[PDB]
Scaffold this active site. Structure first.
Site, PDB file in Angstrom:
ATOM      1  N   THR A 128      66.097  67.009  -7.729  1.00  0.00           N
ATOM      2  CA  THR A 128      65.295  67.831  -8.479  1.00  0.00           C
ATOM      3  C   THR A 128      64.181  67.337  -9.222  1.00  0.00           C
ATOM      4  OG1 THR A 128      67.074  69.350  -8.693  1.00  0.00           O
ATOM      5  CG2 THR A 128      65.418  69.653 -10.057  1.00  0.00           C
ATOM      6  N   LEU A 163      49.445  49.628   0.180  1.00  0.00           N
ATOM      7  CA  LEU A 163      48.062  49.263   0.013  1.00  0.00           C
ATOM      8  C   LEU A 163      47.933  48.038   0.768  1.00  0.00           C
ATOM      9  CD1 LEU A 163      46.838  50.090  -3.356  1.00  0.00           C
ATOM     10  CD2 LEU A 163      47.146  51.655  -1.728  1.00  0.00           C
ATOM     11  N   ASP A 182      65.134  76.480  -7.245  1.00  0.00           N
ATOM     12  CA  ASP A 182      65.649  75.021  -6.990  1.00  0.00           C
ATOM     13  C   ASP A 182      66.785  75.156  -5.795  1.00  0.00           C
ATOM     14  OD1 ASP A 182      66.987  72.705  -7.404  1.00  0.00           O
ATOM     15  OD2 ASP A 182      67.431  72.933  -9.605  1.00  0.00           O
ATOM     16  N   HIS A 238      63.502  71.510  -2.883  1.00  0.00           N
ATOM     17  CA  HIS A 238      64.357  70.713  -1.806  1.00  0.00           C
ATOM     18  C   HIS A 238      65.471  71.753  -1.188  1.00  0.00           C
ATOM     19  CE1 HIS A 238      67.611  70.676  -4.717  1.00  0.00           C
ATOM     20  NE2 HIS A 238      66.950  70.203  -5.491  1.00  0.00           N
ATOM     21  N   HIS A 269      75.662  74.095  -4.783  1.00  0.00           N
ATOM     22  CA  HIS A 269      76.456  73.080  -4.767  1.00  0.00           C
ATOM     23  C   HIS A 269      78.148  73.595  -4.893  1.00  0.00           C
ATOM     24  CE1 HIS A 269      73.814  69.774  -5.741  1.00  0.00           C
ATOM     25  NE2 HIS A 269      73.109  70.450  -6.471  1.00  0.00           N
ATOM     26  N   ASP A 304      53.364  47.616  -2.328  1.00  0.00           N
ATOM     27  CA  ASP A 304      52.858  48.958  -2.975  1.00  0.00           C
ATOM     28  C   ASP A 304      52.008  49.896  -1.918  1.00  0.00           C
ATOM     29  OD1 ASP A 304      50.454  47.370  -1.980  1.00  0.00           O
ATOM     30  OD2 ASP A 304      49.381  47.269  -3.948  1.00  0.00           O
TER      31      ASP A 304
HETATM   32  C1  LIG Z   1      49.131  56.999  -4.759  1.00  0.00           C
HETATM   33  O1  LIG Z   1      48.112  57.441  -6.156  1.00  0.00           O
HETATM   34  C2  LIG Z   1      48.149  56.687  -7.037  1.00  0.00           C
HETATM   35  C3  LIG Z   1      47.086  57.398  -8.039  1.00  0.00           C
HETATM   36  O2  LIG Z   1      45.840  57.056  -7.568  1.00  0.00           O
HETATM   37  C4  LIG Z   1      47.934  55.380  -6.846  1.00  0.00           C
HETATM   38  O3  LIG Z   1      48.207  54.488  -8.040  1.00  0.00           O
HETATM   39  C5  LIG Z   1      47.094  53.865  -8.652  1.00  0.00           C
HETATM   40  O4  LIG Z   1      46.962  52.565  -8.008  1.00  0.00           O
HETATM   41  C6  LIG Z   1      45.554  51.894  -8.468  1.00  0.00           C
HETATM   42  C7  LIG Z   1      45.395  50.740  -7.700  1.00  0.00           C
HETATM   43  O5  LIG Z   1      46.595  49.955  -7.318  1.00  0.00           O
HETATM   44  C8  LIG Z   1      45.833  51.689 -10.014  1.00  0.00           C
HETATM   45  O6  LIG Z   1      44.855  51.043 -10.716  1.00  0.00           O
HETATM   46  C9  LIG Z   1      45.131  50.053 -11.578  1.00  0.00           C
HETATM   47  O7  LIG Z   1      45.258  50.609 -12.904  1.00  0.00           O
HETATM   48  C10 LIG Z   1      45.850  49.622 -14.034  1.00  0.00           C
HETATM   49  C11 LIG Z   1      45.786  50.247 -15.356  1.00  0.00           C
HETATM   50  O8  LIG Z   1      47.015  50.598 -15.595  1.00  0.00           O
HETATM   51  C12 LIG Z   1      47.223  51.866 -16.411  1.00  0.00           C
HETATM   52  O9  LIG Z   1      45.950  52.891 -16.545  1.00  0.00           O
HETATM   53  C13 LIG Z   1      46.207  53.984 -15.551  1.00  0.00           C
HETATM   54  C14 LIG Z   1      45.039  55.151 -15.943  1.00  0.00           C
HETATM   55  O10 LIG Z   1      45.340  56.173 -16.803  1.00  0.00           O
HETATM   56  C15 LIG Z   1      47.644  54.946 -15.601  1.00  0.00           C
HETATM   57  O11 LIG Z   1      47.659  55.480 -14.309  1.00  0.00           O
HETATM   58  C16 LIG Z   1      48.693  53.641 -15.394  1.00  0.00           C
HETATM   59  O12 LIG Z   1      49.867  54.008 -15.406  1.00  0.00           O
HETATM   60  C17 LIG Z   1      50.992  53.406 -14.482  1.00  0.00           C
HETATM   61  O13 LIG Z   1      51.868  52.501 -15.624  1.00  0.00           O
HETATM   62  C18 LIG Z   1      52.589  52.799 -16.285  1.00  0.00           C
HETATM   63  C19 LIG Z   1      53.996  51.968 -16.047  1.00  0.00           C
HETATM   64  O14 LIG Z   1      53.978  50.804 -16.916  1.00  0.00           O
HETATM   65  C20 LIG Z   1      53.409  54.247 -16.079  1.00  0.00           C
HETATM   66  O15 LIG Z   1      53.186  54.977 -17.318  1.00  0.00           O
HETATM   67  C21 LIG Z   1      52.822  55.021 -14.962  1.00  0.00           C
HETATM   68  O16 LIG Z   1      53.668  55.498 -14.100  1.00  0.00           O
HETATM   69  C22 LIG Z   1      51.862  54.243 -14.000  1.00  0.00           C
HETATM   70  O17 LIG Z   1      52.800  53.415 -13.255  1.00  0.00           O
HETATM   71  C23 LIG Z   1      52.732  53.001 -11.794  1.00  0.00           C
HETATM   72  O18 LIG Z   1      51.472  52.323 -11.373  1.00  0.00           O
HETATM   73  C24 LIG Z   1      51.425  50.933 -11.911  1.00  0.00           C
HETATM   74  C25 LIG Z   1      50.187  50.148 -11.256  1.00  0.00           C
HETATM   75  O19 LIG Z   1      49.203  50.597 -12.467  1.00  0.00           O
HETATM   76  C26 LIG Z   1      52.881  50.330 -11.255  1.00  0.00           C
HETATM   77  O20 LIG Z   1      53.125  48.892 -11.922  1.00  0.00           O
HETATM   78  C27 LIG Z   1      54.179  51.194 -11.394  1.00  0.00           C
HETATM   79  O21 LIG Z   1      55.350  50.617 -10.841  1.00  0.00           O
HETATM   80  C28 LIG Z   1      53.934  52.567 -10.815  1.00  0.00           C
HETATM   81  O22 LIG Z   1      53.836  52.550  -9.577  1.00  0.00           O
HETATM   82  C29 LIG Z   1      48.424  52.136 -16.530  1.00  0.00           C
HETATM   83  O23 LIG Z   1      49.409  52.655 -17.645  1.00  0.00           O
HETATM   84  C30 LIG Z   1      44.967  48.161 -13.795  1.00  0.00           C
HETATM   85  O24 LIG Z   1      45.773  47.051 -14.640  1.00  0.00           O
HETATM   86  C31 LIG Z   1      44.756  47.462 -12.394  1.00  0.00           C
HETATM   87  O25 LIG Z   1      43.942  46.711 -12.577  1.00  0.00           O
HETATM   88  C32 LIG Z   1      44.514  45.276 -12.190  1.00  0.00           C
HETATM   89  O26 LIG Z   1      44.168  44.966 -10.829  1.00  0.00           O
HETATM   90  C33 LIG Z   1      42.944  44.989 -10.595  1.00  0.00           C
HETATM   91  C34 LIG Z   1      42.438  44.922  -9.111  1.00  0.00           C
HETATM   92  O27 LIG Z   1      41.309  46.011  -8.911  1.00  0.00           O
HETATM   93  C35 LIG Z   1      42.009  43.708 -11.207  1.00  0.00           C
HETATM   94  O28 LIG Z   1      40.708  43.781 -11.063  1.00  0.00           O
HETATM   95  C36 LIG Z   1      42.330  43.958 -12.726  1.00  0.00           C
HETATM   96  O29 LIG Z   1      41.945  42.821 -13.528  1.00  0.00           O
HETATM   97  C37 LIG Z   1      43.799  44.218 -13.110  1.00  0.00           C
HETATM   98  O30 LIG Z   1      44.621  42.881 -12.685  1.00  0.00           O
HETATM   99  C38 LIG Z   1      44.976  42.255 -13.705  1.00  0.00           C
HETATM  100  O31 LIG Z   1      46.418  42.373 -14.307  1.00  0.00           O
HETATM  101  C39 LIG Z   1      47.175  42.058 -13.271  1.00  0.00           C
HETATM  102  C40 LIG Z   1      48.707  42.567 -13.776  1.00  0.00           C
HETATM  103  O32 LIG Z   1      48.820  43.085 -14.936  1.00  0.00           O
HETATM  104  C41 LIG Z   1      47.077  40.432 -13.463  1.00  0.00           C
HETATM  105  O33 LIG Z   1      48.183  39.881 -12.312  1.00  0.00           O
HETATM  106  C42 LIG Z   1      45.864  39.944 -12.758  1.00  0.00           C
HETATM  107  O34 LIG Z   1      45.865  38.409 -13.072  1.00  0.00           O
HETATM  108  C43 LIG Z   1      44.611  40.682 -13.592  1.00  0.00           C
HETATM  109  O35 LIG Z   1      44.041  39.700 -14.640  1.00  0.00           O
HETATM  110  C44 LIG Z   1      44.513  48.705 -11.371  1.00  0.00           C
HETATM  111  O36 LIG Z   1      42.894  49.010 -11.578  1.00  0.00           O
HETATM  112  C45 LIG Z   1      46.541  52.670 -11.021  1.00  0.00           C
HETATM  113  O37 LIG Z   1      47.006  52.566 -11.972  1.00  0.00           O
HETATM  114  C46 LIG Z   1      47.691  53.495 -10.011  1.00  0.00           C
HETATM  115  N1  LIG Z   1      47.991  55.022 -10.838  1.00  0.00           N
HETATM  116  C47 LIG Z   1      48.951  55.536 -10.924  1.00  0.00           C
HETATM  117  C48 LIG Z   1      49.247  56.705 -11.737  1.00  0.00           C
HETATM  118  O38 LIG Z   1      50.007  54.999 -10.632  1.00  0.00           O
HETATM  119  C49 LIG Z   1      48.745  54.848  -5.682  1.00  0.00           C
HETATM  120  O39 LIG Z   1      48.140  53.654  -5.125  1.00  0.00           O
HETATM  121  C50 LIG Z   1      48.795  55.920  -4.335  1.00  0.00           C
HETATM  122  N2  LIG Z   1      49.799  55.226  -3.384  1.00  0.00           N
HETATM  123  C51 LIG Z   1      49.349  55.195  -2.216  1.00  0.00           C
HETATM  124  C52 LIG Z   1      50.387  54.502  -1.178  1.00  0.00           C
HETATM  125  O40 LIG Z   1      48.217  55.247  -1.784  1.00  0.00           O
HETATM  126 CA   LIG Z   2      66.424  71.123  -7.589  1.00  0.00          CA
HETATM  127 CA   LIG Z   3      49.900  45.656  -0.677  1.00  0.00          CA
END
Ligand SMILES: *[C@@H]1O[C@H](CO)[C@@H](O[C@@H]2O[C@H](CO)[C@@H](O[C@@H]3O[C@H](CO[C@H]4O[C@H](CO)[C@@H](O)[C@H](O[C@H]5O[C@H](CO)[C@@H](O)[C@H](O)[C@@H]5O[C@H]5O[C@H](CO)[C@@H](O)[C@H](O)[C@@H]5O)[C@@H]4O)[C@@H](O)[C@H](O[C@H]4O[C@H](CO)[C@@H](O)[C@H](O)[C@@H]4O[C@H]4O[C@H](CO)[C@@H](O)[C@H](O)[C@@H]4O)[C@@H]3O)[C@H](O)[C@H]2NC(C)=O)[C@H](O)[C@H]1NC(C)=O
Ligand SMILES: [Ca+2]
Ligand SMILES: [Ca+2]
Ligand SMILES: NS(=O)(=O)c1ccc(C(=O)N2C[C@H]3CN(C(=O)c4cc(OCC5CCOCC5)nc(C5CC5)c4)C[C@@H]3C2)c(F)c1
Ligand SMILES: [K+]
Ligand code: NA
Length: 805
Positions: free
Chosen positions: A159, A689, A121, A309, A265, A687
């Site tokens: 951290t 993207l 750390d 870090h 620190h 996002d």
């Molecule tokens: C960095 O890498 C990561 C990892 O690959 C990238 O993030 C991914 O982005 C994907 C594309 O955006 C995304 O795929 C979506 O999955 C949704 C299902 O969600 C759950 O399942 C997964 C799988 O295990 C899981 O990872 C998720 O976990 C998130 O949620 C909780 C918080 O509530 C947390 O425990 C966890 O930390 C994580 O949070 C993060 O991601 C979410 C987004 O999912 C953010 O909101 C948080 O802030 C945080 O950043 C989930 O538990 C699924 O719902 C999506 O599908 C919607 O969109 C599609 C388009 O294809 C549409 O067709 C679908 O129908 C659906 O839309 C419907 O719902 C909408 C809203 O509810 C609604 O408005 C519409 O009308 C529709 O009806 C989508 O397929 C994937 O989840 C994340 N993964 C992670 C881990 O974050 C990231 O993009 C990369 N970053 C860069 C810059 O490249």
């Molecule tokens: Ca630290």
């Molecule tokens: Ca975007």
């Protein structure tokens, strides 16, 4: 509840935790307050210390001892780490010369080399050089293994966000650990360093390495250590686990040290008191390496030495107080320190307005040591917006400084001389990476890289498939002797149209007023071939970008530039051109200033117009290929095509013009030619993207012309700068940016001065990786080079940071 009634005998440091209220014997039981009554007695033996001496050599085993020097100790795997040194005339691992480890040299029964992750750390990158004399074991790992001069953490450089990034390959906005302190408004719950809440699983998103391993049938050591378990005992436990028989023995292990961060620190990064914690960490490394050598595993295990870090000098008196800015200070909640997060104290207050808080915080004192942002306007390279746990109002704090709400917060809580959390490009925040073992390269230096890439390499080291993450898998292939991952380029989804001349001038009603009436046989077979692609070899050096989503678009050729024109967004997705070292800058001639010409290859329906700009009192326009750099005045007409025009706020135009008129030519002089690719970005939902068409929140008034959130450029040249960019034989060099497209320049406090006093500073702040631009556009660059694909993936993750060495 806990019935601590049972016994820890035989269960000392348990790989599979048991459930409430039955009592635990695992390395985390203490931190839960739940160990069996006899845990300390049995599992935390301290008797006779941590080292064998001459007299203990061939003692009769005494089961009270901290560790053993008895004949049987080796097959039991519980000797003191220095046993064979003191009792059998062997040397300390650090005194052995290094010899290349070409293959794993493992005991029979090992199916893969184990991985040990030794994390430290607050270990700042410059400690490798500045403490070399007092860290011989670490120095040997470094010089014999593969090492980077530094490794870039994630923002915030705190951290928990960094340890969890190392575990998952995800940005904090995606894994959910966005700070050391958090409020989740959906859960209505708070996460704090101190206390119980942090243990609830709902905080921790993605899939960390130990779950990945478990789900694919690889056994994991337990990664987490209770603070009171002394370092020596942590090392002993890992060595004992490595003695376990074939189907019990884990394949991956973690050690964590609270130092040097704890002392950093109190005393500052280079306080004189810092030499001793550095000595103590090296001694622990020595114990691990002697221990592995006794077990004949020192040429079998891969070891990673890695920090979360660095550490900066920061003191109580370098604190900015929001009470000096805001008259309404009791209406806000602030997460204070090396970053600022602001929200309403109460969501029932209708007087709380973000806009006027931001305004009251903007360029108010002449040397203000923080800058306010709406989170969507932070530099895109921080990837710190897309999570409901990140407040709308953010303060980026200058290195060496703190922010706080009121003076009474800072004296009723000088204590600290060091802190961390700042912008992750800041030099004092950089940290360390060394890899040593059979799978790593021998005596190799690699360029600096980001910690988000490591999870993929840890999965490669273990034969695991990584869960989806923010690394670029294969960009760190150059660290590895084997187990490299060989990806393929993503497939092109949309193929380009190549339109010819299909429209007459009078089909357009653009409302511009261009002067362009000036009229030859030799020049017209030559301006023809320029429209069909003869200078394309010059202007498109690495192939056309592939479009990775479904859309409708046109390739447009010109003497000085090529573009990929979107019929959907009514502008280029990308514009490519090469400016040689010899290029001349000319000025814009007045006959042409507000001239904009129809492009006879593209329909009026799929074109912009001048009238919408004339009606929009806020919005003006600029050009992607700069008219200032046109090669001849015949070619200068191509620059004024309606298909080269993009919407720009007048405030942004000042930044863009200076980039195009002054900076491009400068970069070409310095770098021996540059190839430039420029275009728009639309990220309305922040996002990171590419937006679909239905996510666009703003249009040029009374039109279908979408307004970009950002403008990008990718500026590429030969790494060997004695060759020109257009005839480069080897590796490339690259710098890029993602500039926010903003209606004002409030971000730059000096913007009333000349652009040569502030524009370039703004560009440096918004420096970017090619990969960031790829996520934001759905495009894939450098499709056609003569380089290996792994080298190209490394190039695409590169970030030009603008800090000194
Ligand atoms: C960095 O890498 C990561 C990892 O690959 C990238 O993030 C991914 O982005 C994907 C594309 O955006 C995304 O795929 C979506 O999955 C949704 C299902 O969600 C759950 O399942 C997964 C799988 O295990 C899981 O990872 C998720 O976990 C998130 O949620 C909780 C918080 O509530 C947390 O425990 C966890 O930390 C994580 O949070 C993060 O991601 C979410 C987004 O999912 C953010 O909101 C948080 O802030 C945080 O950043 C989930 O538990 C699924 O719902 C999506 O599908 C919607 O969109 C599609 C388009 O294809 C549409 O067709 C679908 O129908 C659906 O839309 C419907 O719902 C909408 C809203 O509810 C609604 O408005 C519409 O009308 C529709 O009806 C989508 O397929 C994937 O989840 C994340 N993964 C992670 C881990 O974050 C990231 O993009 C990369 N970053 C860069 C810059 O490249
Ligand atoms: Ca630290
Ligand atoms: Ca975007
Ligand atoms: N910042 S500060 O305010 O100064 C500050 C603030 C708080 C503390 C603190 O109390 N500690 C005590 C430490 C015990 N500990 C772990 O055991 C641990 C190891 C790990 O390791 C993850 C592996 C993943 C693979 O890469 C290497 C590490 N992951 C996790 C988490 C991500 C899931 C936890 C880290 C805890 C922080 C501090 F000490 C300094
Ligand atoms: K206008
Ligand atoms: Na300003």
């Amino acid at each position: 509840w806990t019935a601590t009634s049972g016994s820890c005998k035989g269960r000392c440091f348990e790989l599979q935790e048991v459930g409430p209220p039955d009592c635990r014997c695992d390395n985390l039981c203490k931190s839960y307050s739940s160990c069996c009554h006899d845990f300390d007695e049995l599992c935390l033996k301290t008797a006779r210390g941590w080292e064998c001496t001459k007299d203990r050599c061939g003692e009769v085993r005494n089961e009270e001892n901290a560790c053993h020097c008895s004949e049987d100790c080796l097959s039991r795997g519980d000797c003191c780490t220095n046993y064979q040194v003191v009792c059998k005339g062997e040397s300390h691992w650090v005194d052995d010369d290094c010899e290349e480890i070409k293959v794993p040299e493992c005991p029979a029964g090992f199916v893969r080399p184990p991985l040990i992750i030794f994390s430290v750390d607050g270990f700042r990158a410059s400690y490798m050089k500045k403490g070399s004399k007092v860290m011989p074991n670490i120095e040997k790992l470094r010089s014999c293994g593969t090492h980077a001069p530094y490794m870039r953490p994630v923002y915030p450089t705190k951290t928990f966000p960094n340890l969890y990034t190392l575990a998952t390959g995800l940005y904090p906005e995606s894994h959910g650990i966005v700070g050391n302190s958090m409020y989740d408004p959906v859960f209505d719950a708070s996460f704090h360093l101190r206390g119980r809440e942090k243990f609830n699983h709902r905080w921790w998103g993605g899939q960390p390495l130990w779950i990945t391993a478990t789900k694919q049938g690889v056994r994991a050591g337990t990664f987490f250590w209770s603070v009171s378990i002394p370092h020596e005992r942590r090392i002993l436990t890992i060595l004992q686990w490595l003695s376990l028989p074939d189907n019990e023995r884990p394949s991956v292990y973690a050690f964590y040290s609270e130092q040097p961060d704890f002392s950093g620190h109190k005393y500052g990064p280079f306080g004189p008191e810092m030499t001793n914690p550095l000595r103590e960490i090296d001694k622990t490394v020595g114990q691990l390496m002697d221990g592995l050598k006794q077990l004949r595993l020192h040429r079998c295990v891969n070891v990673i030495f890695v920090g979360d870090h660095g550490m900066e000098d920061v003191t109580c008196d370098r604190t900015e107080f929001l009470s000096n800015y805001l008259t309404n200070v009791d209406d806000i909640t602030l997460v204070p320190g090396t970053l600022g997060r602001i929200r309403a104290k109460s969501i029932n207050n209708s007087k709380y307005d973000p806009k006027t808080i931001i305004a009251a915080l903007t360029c108010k004192k002449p040397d203000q040591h923080f800058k306010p942002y709406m989170k969507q306007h932070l530099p895109k390279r921080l990837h710190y917006a897309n999570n409901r746990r990140i407040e709308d109002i953010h303060l980026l704090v200058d290195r060496r400084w703190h922010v706080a709400r009121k003076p009474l917060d800072v004296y009723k809580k000088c204590f600290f001389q060091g802190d961390h959390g700042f912008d992750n490009k800041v030099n004092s925040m950089q940290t360390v990476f060394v890899g040593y073992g059979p799978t790593f390269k021998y005596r190799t230096k690699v360029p600096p890289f980001e910690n988000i890439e490591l999870y993929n390499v840890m999965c490669d080291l273990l034969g695991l498939k990584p869960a989806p993450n923010n690394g670029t898998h294969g960009s760190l292939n150059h660290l590895l002797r084997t187990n490299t991952f060989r990806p393929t380029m993503p497939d092109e989804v949309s193929r380009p149209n190549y339109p010819g001349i299909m429209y007459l001038q009078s089909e357009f009603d653009l409302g511009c007023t261009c002067d362009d009436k000036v009229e030859n046989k030799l020049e017209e077979l030559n301006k023809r071939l320029h429209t069909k692609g003869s200078t394309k070899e010059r202007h498109l050096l690495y192939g056309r970008p592939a479009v990775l989503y479904r859309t409708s678009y046109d390739i447009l050729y010109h003497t000085d530039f090529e573009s990929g024109y979107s019929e959907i967004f009514l502008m280029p997705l990308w514009t490519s051109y090469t400016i040689s070292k010899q290029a001349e800058v000319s000025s814009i001639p007045e006959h042409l200033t507000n001239c904009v010409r129809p492009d006879v290859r593209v329909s009026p329906g799929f074109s912009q117009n001048c009238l919408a700009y004339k009606n929009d009192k806020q919005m003006s326009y600029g050009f992607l290929f700069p008219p200032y750099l046109s090669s001849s005045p015949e070619a200068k007409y191509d620059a004024f095509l309606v298909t080269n025009m993009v919407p720009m706020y007048p405030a942004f135009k000042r930044v863009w013009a200076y980039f195009q008129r002054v900076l491009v030519k400068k970069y070409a002089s310095e770098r021996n030619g540059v190839n430039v690719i420029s275009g728009p970005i639309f990220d309305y939902n922040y996002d990171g993207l590419r937006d679909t068409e239905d996510e666009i929140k703003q249009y040029v008034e009374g039109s279908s012309i979408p307004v970009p959130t950002h403008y990008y450029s990718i500026i590429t040249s030969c790494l060997d700068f004695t060759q020109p960019a257009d005839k480069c034989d080897g590796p490339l060099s690259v710098s890029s940016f993602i500039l926010p497209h903003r209606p004002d320049n409030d971000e730059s406090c000096n913007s009333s001065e000349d652009e040569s006093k502030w524009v370039e500073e703004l560009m440096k702040m918004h420096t970017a990786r090619v990969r960031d631009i790829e996520h934001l556009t759905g495009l894939d660059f450098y499709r056609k080079t003569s380089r290996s694909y792994s080298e190209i993936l490394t190039l695409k993750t590169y970030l030009h940071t603008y800090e000194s060495e």
